[PDB]
Structures are given as structure tokens and as C-alpha cells.
Design a protein around this ligand. Structure first.
Ligand SMILES: CC[C@H](C)[C@H](N)C(=O)N[C@@H](CCCC[NH3+])C(=O)O
Ligand code: CA
Ligand code: CA
Ligand code: CA
Ligand code: CA
Ligand code: ZN
Length: 316
């Protein structure tokens, strides 16, 4: 909508107060004009028609229970935009400041969040399995990273290419969570999963097998569920990424960690310069090797650690 840029205040899903960028034109809308062509947050009103209505508020204060998922979707889309721009010099998901659109209050009791090819979509959860999913910075950043991937490598969402697609979303979802630097970890979705259970998450990058996912190629899933295991086999790549950053010894193979910033540089370059729609895990190793060679040199520690990490998870 055309209007003037304003700054509202509200509370997110976990009860934290934050300032949000809004636009005033009769109402105050969740439209942030400070980032690219805008960040826009919509109310799906418990239905499944998308995007729904651009979020309108009479007083620029967003402290109602019903407001909290919107506050966080909007705010965390901003953080994710800032990460890509400031860390990777990328302007929005398409690299040309595309508008970022999100809908909250999708359906009733909906225990998921997704990128639909055009926008973000967040359920409220059923209150037991999940609370509203935009409360998780890693979740927001995971979903927006699918838009990045779709515009860049274009990894097909099935089988090994799909597991790479998922891992890239977990990797950058986690790196955004560290960038924001509130309560960061190498777990996925802990802040919105199972409010009645402390210390769990959907997936772990540090130990995928904690939640039943493979941590070595020899344990890969080859059945048909989950688009050929895209959220299962992502554990193999997530473990490799974790080892590259943090180091460790895994199945007897020792990796020297090179830290999060270099992990991010290597995988961002692989995603944007080397991966293709049909890349498999072997091809990802090659892309990450080439990317680290570009950035650091063929005889670098960084290249060595990339190779050691893929070796550790059985990917040649
Ligand atoms: C990043 C987390 C986000 C919810 C994502 N769409 C996801 O990982 N979903 C998988 C895990 C289950 C989520 C709730 N049932 C999924 O399999 O869809
Ligand atoms: Ca209000
Ligand atoms: Ca966390
Ligand atoms: Ca996390
Ligand atoms: Ca929990
Ligand atoms: Zn995903």
C-alpha cells in the first residue's frame, strides 16, 4: 500500500517485545519499506486461501495474542534479509530486492511452515506439537532459504538433490539464528516445538541420529516417504556442515573446524555458483571443494576440512 513508513511495537510468540517496521495509510500495516521492495505480512485468518489480507492494525501496537505470530514472521523476515545482504551481499531471495511476503494463521492447528513458490506460510500449531511456527528464527530463515535455493541452484525437491535443498535451509536457518545471536544452537525449531518438553527439537545438525536421522551415507534412506527422505537424508549433509564449522571426530575421522563464517561463505558460493537442479551428494562435495578452493586456495586448511568432513559422513 502507499503510505508513510512508521515504527510499531509488539510482542512475539515467546513474549519478547520488539519494534517492527510498518506503513501508515488509515491503518498501520505490516509493510516494512526499509528492506528492498518491502517485507509484507498477511493474515490468513485460519483459512488456506493465500495470501489473505495485508495485516492491518488500528494503533501500531501489536500486543494481542493473535498479533504475536505476525510480529515474529515480519521481524524475522527482516533479520533474514539483513543476514543475506550484510553477510553475502545478496539483496533478497532473488538478488534483486524481491518483496518478501509471509502469511500467518494458516489453517487450524497446522503443525508446519513452508515456502509455496511465492511466499512464506506459517501455521499456528496445535498447541501441543507446535506453537506458532514463526516464533522460531531458524524456521523463518529455513523457509526463506528455500526461496534463495529455488532462484539459484534450483535443487529438485526429491532424493539426494532434495536432501541437499533441505540441508541448505537448515544450514542457513542456523547461521541466521547465530547472526541474530539471541539463543543460538545447531538444533532446528527448538523454540516452537513441543512447549511441554524441554530440550528437544525437530532435527539436530550436531547429532542427527538424536531424532532418527542418518549421520553417514551408509545409513541413507532409499524408500519413497518424504519425497525420498529429504528431511531424513539431510542429516548426512547437516552433519558434514556441522563438522566443517565446529570440528570433531565422527566414525573415527577427525575434522578440524574452520568456524561458522567460513562454513557460510563456502556453502553460499557452492549454492550460487556450482550446484545445479540435479546435484547429488557427490556433486555437493565437489562444489564445496571448488568453492573453498576459490576462496582459500587448494592447499588450505579450509579445503582440507571440507574433504575431511565429507569423508567423515561417507560422501566421496
Ligand atoms: C524448518 C522447520 C519447518 C517446520 C520445515 N517445513 C520442516 O522441516 N518440516 C518438516 C518437519 C515437520 C514439521 C512439522 N510436522 C516436514 O517434514 O514437513
Ligand atoms: Ca493494535
Ligand atoms: Ca535456539
Ligand atoms: Ca535452532
Ligand atoms: Ca520442546
Ligand atoms: Zn524445508
Amino acid at each position: 500500500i502507499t503510505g508513510t513508513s512508521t515504527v510499531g511495537v509488539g510482542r512475539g510468540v515467546l513474549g519478547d517485545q520488539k519494534n517492527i517496521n510498518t506503513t501508515y495509510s488509515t491503518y498501520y500495516y505490516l509493510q516494512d519499506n526499509t528492506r528492498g521492495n518491502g517485507i509484507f505480512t498477511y493474515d490468513a485468518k485460519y483459512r488456506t486461501t493465500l495470501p489473505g489480507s495485508l495485516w492491518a492494525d488500528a494503533d501500531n501496537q501489536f500486543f494481542a495474542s493473535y498479533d504475536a505470530p505476525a510480529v515474529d514472521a515480519h521481524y524475522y523476515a527482516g533479520v533474514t534479509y539483513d543476514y543475506y545482504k550484510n553477510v553475502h551481499n545478496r539483496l533478497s531471495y532473488d538478488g534483486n530486492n524481491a518483496a518478501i511476503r509471509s502469511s500467518v494463521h494458516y489453517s487450524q492447528g497446522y503443525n508446519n511452515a513452508f515456502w509455496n513458490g511465492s511466499q512464506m506460510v506459517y501455521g499456528d500449531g496445535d498447541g501441543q506439537t507446535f506453537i506458532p511456527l514463526s516464533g522460531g528464527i531458524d524456521v523463518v530463515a529455513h523457509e526463506l532459504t528455500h526461496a534463495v535455493t529455488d532462484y539459484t541452484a534450483g535443487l529438485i525437491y526429491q532424493n539426494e538433490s532434495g536432501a541437499i535443498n533441505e540441508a541448505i535451509s537448515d544450514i542457513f536457518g542456523t547461521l541466521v539464528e547465530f547472526y541474530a545471536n539471541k539463543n543460538p544452537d545447531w538444533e532446528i525449531g527448538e523454540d516452537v516445538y513441543t512447549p511441554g518438553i524441554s530440550g528437544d527439537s525437530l532435527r539436530s545438525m550436531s547429532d542427527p541420529a538424536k531424532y532418527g536421522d542418518p549421520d553417514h551415507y551408509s545409513k541413507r534412506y532409499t524408500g519413497t516417504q518424504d519425497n525420498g527422505g529429504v528431511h531424513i537424508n539431510s542429516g548426512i549433509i547437516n552433519k558434514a556442515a556441522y563438522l566443517i564449522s565446529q570440528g570433531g571426530t565422527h566414525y573415527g575421522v577427525s575434522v578440524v573446524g574452520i568456524g561458522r563464517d567460513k562454513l557460510g561463505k563456502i556453502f553460499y558460493r557452492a549454492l550460487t555458483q556450482y550446484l545445479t537442479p540435479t546435484s547429488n551428494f557427490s556433486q555437493l562435495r565437489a562444489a564445496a571443494v571448488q568453492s573453498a578452493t576459490d576462496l582459500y586456495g587448494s592447499t588450505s586448511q579450509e579445503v582440507a576440512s571440507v574433504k575431511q568432513a565429507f569423508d567423515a559422513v561417507g560422501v566421496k
